[model samples]
Structures are given as structure tokens and as C-alpha cells.
Target: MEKSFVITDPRLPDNPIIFASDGFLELTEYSREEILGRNGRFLQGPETDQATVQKIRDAIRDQREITVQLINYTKSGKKFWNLLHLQPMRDQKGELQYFIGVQLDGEFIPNPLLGLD
Candidate 1:
């Protein structure tokens, strides 16, 4: 649970960001206002690999689990290698429900002003 996590409503049009943990805020440098309505792909930048993006796309399309590494950028445009794991969660009846994204490489120095370690 300490891993930087995001909940995405893939059933919604465009798979909006529903929730992000404090660890996510520490790593991405994005406030809730900036992240709530956006997709996780917001982290992708010019240096990100298209192949890796395609892999994620494929997995999401098939509702499968995936783990990949890609260069991601913070709000200030600083780059970091993100170890990302994505999986589709389901309801009790075995129906696809939400997408869970965990950033394994979420170790980042929190801003002093935020008061989060």
C-alpha cells in the first residue's frame, strides 16, 4: 500500500484518474487538482519509448497485467525511470472494474514545503 498508487476508471470515457496516493504526489509533483481529471499517460514525455507505450496499450486493451519501465517526467520536467506495474481489478462476479497502477520506483525526495517524507 505504500507504493505510489493510482486508481483509474477505465470504464469511463478516456480512463480518468480517480485517485492518487500521497506517494504518487511525492513522485509526480502534481497536486490533486492537476491529476484527478488526467490519465497516467500525462507522465510520458518525448524521451519515453513508443514500444513500451504500445505494450501498455496492448495490455490495457486486453485487460491483462503488465510491468514495464519508462522515462517519466515530473511537473517541473525532471526525468525519472519509473518502474510501473498495471493490472485490471475486478468485481466479485469476475467482471473488469478498475485499473490499478503501482509505481514501484516511487522513491523521491519530498518537497520540504509539503511536509511529507
Candidate 2:
């Protein structure tokens, strides 16, 4: 929404500046330079299991909207459950150019099925 959501030194404004509200900026701690020209994939770390990562890449490549649950963290190394979402925004040429990603804090769900001791 607002550019304040993200912190970028210069990278975040080189071209298609995808602004992240200050809310996300404080959460991720990424400078404008670091994010402006880079893909959101930077936020992903080793904990981003192979399965979900591939799924995310595939969906984005196809310009298909998809949502998935995964383990993600803040730049400060704060581990939290993250609900990764990616939606596409097309340009006049009808090309999937920019993607809007919103990360929601995932809740801790212990168990759905019964667990026997």
C-alpha cells in the first residue's frame, strides 16, 4: 500500500517500486535498496522447506494466484508461522508484472486429529 511499509536503501526504488507498508518494513527490516530491485524471494530462508518453495516458484511463474502455509521468520531471526500469499497484478500489455505478497501471522494449531498417548 504505502511505501513506508518497507525499508530500502536504493534497490527498492530502481524500477517497479513495490512498496510495502511500514508495518512490513518494521517486521522485515529490509532497506529500500535491498528490496526495490530484488525479488521477494530474498525473504525466504533455509527453513523454507523444498516442497513449499517449489510450489511458490511454480505458481508465480505461471502467474497463478496461490496461498500456502510455511515456516518463515523476520530479519531479526524471529521464527514465526507465516501464511505466504501471492497475487498478480497485470499491466496494460496483460503481462503478469508485479506481484503483491501479504504475509499473515499464522496461528499455532496443535492438532486437528486426536492424538493418543
Candidate 3:
């Protein structure tokens, strides 16, 4: 199901690209292409603390499924808590080739006025 929102990116050599599809416009004020190949870091604004990111990384390393209570910013720079789904898809050689992510808009997770220096 493509649903109203869809974002699909193939994990590259060193990083991941975030694709925010057009159907998501109703949920977020962003266009489909604007977020393509964008670093996931955009979601790290003032509201996304480093600790949470580290925890997410750790969970990934452990090869465990993790559901994060994260606050991500919209293209308009507004913040929202998203039920983000992420996973690594392995290729025929049992090697990691791509990373996938899908987001379900949960609720608003307001960001702090300031960020790390």
C-alpha cells in the first residue's frame, strides 16, 4: 500500500537519503523530491537529542527492531513526533545493500528553541 505518504531510498556507500513523497503533503508541508537524498540528520533539529540517536544506532547494530519516539522537523521546519520504521535490506550475498524507512505521523513533538552548539 503506497498510502497517502511514501518515502523510499536506497542506502548509499556512506549514508542514507530520505525521500518524502508527495502524498505526505497533507501530513507534512514538504514536497516529494525536496527530501530525496537528504541526510536523515534534518530530523535532528533541536528536539532530537543526541542520546536518542545513539540509542537508535545501538539498536541497529544489535540487529534489533526499534520503534523510536522521535520528533522530526518538516520542510517548513515544524516538528512532529513520528513513528518511524527503518530496516536494512540485505542483498544476495547476505551483505547489506539498502536501507529503508517509513514514517507514520503520530503527534506533534515540539522542538526546543535552541540546539547543541
Candidate 4:
């Protein structure tokens, strides 16, 4: 459906995932029972870049928005490149509520410079 996403409660310990869409379950090959109340780091493997992981962690701590392409593993241990867009959700009082992470599979190529055209 091209709409894989997860909503995690930052107020919770370890920022565990509170809600996961069906598309996210399909994309990660994980069941709802296995995913809820769990940290997302399970998708990261030995080959997953530590720098990218740190970038995400830093953004989460700062409650900022960030987008990055990183390698993630599925429940079956198959690796796939995921383009992740993470943003912090705040309430009307400007209090941080939850963090929403959107996942897009595969690499995305950007348009080249105008000089080429």
C-alpha cells in the first residue's frame, strides 16, 4: 500500500511502538503481537550503519524531524533498504506526544542539476 508506518510513544520507556499499521507489518514481516510494545531496533542488524542509527537516536532525543535511508532486516532476516522519515508529534500545548516513523522501501533517485537539462 506504500504506507508503512509506526507510531511510538516517546513518553514510554524505550519509546516502544504503540501502534503499527498493517502495511508496516507486511513490510517488516512481523506480526502485530511481536511488534507492539517493542523498540524498533530489532530491525537493525550487524550491517546496519551505526552512524545512521545515531542520527535517528539524536533526532528522537531532540524531538526533531529527520529523513534517512538505511538498511533494515525483516523477520525472515532478509535485508532491504528503507527510506525512513521520522517526525515528532506534539499536542496543542506544544508538548511532545509521539513519534511517527514512515518507511519507504528501495532507494529513491533525485533529479539531477539543471545544468544537465
Lowest summed lDDT window (length 10), candidate 4: 108-117
lDDT per residue (tens digit) for residues 1-117 in model 1: 355989999889877889999889988888977899688999999988788899999999999999877779989999887889999999999988899899966324332422332
Mind giving the per-residue lDDT tens digits that candidate 4 earns over 17-112? 999999999999999998999988888998787888998999998889999877899999999888899999999999999999999988563413
Model 4 lDDT, full chain set:
0.87
Native RMSD of candidate 3 (Å):
5.6
Q: Per lDDT, what order, best first?
A: 4, 1, 3, 2
Total clashes for model 1: 0
TM-score per candidate: 0.86, 0.68, 0.67, 0.90
lDDT of each: 0.85, 0.60, 0.61, 0.87
Which candidate number has the best TM-score?
4
What does candidate 2's lDDT look like per residue over 5-70, in tens digits?
A: 322222234224357666566667766555565556566777766677788878865778787766
| Count of backbone collisions in candidate 2 | 18
Better of 2 and 4 by lDDT: 4
Candidate 4 lDDT at 57 equals 93
Which residue ranges in model 3 land beyond 4 Å of their true spot? 1-13, 18-20, 24-26, 60-64, 107-117
- Scored by lDDT, model 1 comes in at 0.85
Q: What is the total number of backbone clashes in candidate 4?
A: 0
Select the stronger candidate by TM-score from 1 and 2. 1
